[PDB]
């Protein structure tokens, strides 16, 4: 389709070296070309990488940006056994509704906007429920948009772990921009 979606490249080392590739596709696990993987290279689009095969395990988002080192992609332990392509949904409002309680109760905040530290704008250091929002938002464990991120697919986050979160520990967030 006289166009390109997104190109992901995984290498055992940094500087885009080793025995990596440079083609877009979908497979069970790129672990066939290289077990562990570090830095990456994305050209237009956000690729979703899972810790375990079958799109299962953690959730790392890589938006249009170059990552020569595992320090530029805010990684954890060069752990990746699965990869998939992700496209940004149409829109321009990005609305999120967070609940102080998991059972959708307490002080809830609604509205779009850039949020650096929740424990600042919303005065909350954690969230037990995020409920339905809009399009797709990224969750960061650490403030300033850092610490293993989480991809809020869909469904209803009845609990903090619902979005693959080991704990209700979650910071602010920010709309995705290509």
From Swiss-Prot:
Family assignment? Belongs to the beta/gamma-crystallin family.
Q: Which disease is it linked to?
A: Cataract 20, multiple types: An opacification of the crystalline lens of the eye that frequently results in visual impairment or blindness. Opacities vary in morphology, are often confined to a portion of the lens, and may be static or progressive. In general, the more posteriorly located and dense an opacity, the greater the impact on visual function. CTRCT20 includes progressive polymorphic anterior, posterior, or peripheral cortical.
Q: Which keywords does the record carry?
A: Acetylation, Cataract, Disease variant, Eye lens protein, Repeat
Offer one Pfam family short name for this entry.
Answer: Crystall
**Name of the encoding gene:** CRYGS
Reproduce the free-text note on domains from the UniProt record. Answer: Has a two-domain beta-structure, folded into four very similar Greek key motifs.
In which organism is this protein found? Homo sapiens (Human)
Documented effect of changing residue 39 to C: In CTRCT20; uncertain significance
Listed name of the protein: Gamma-crystallin S
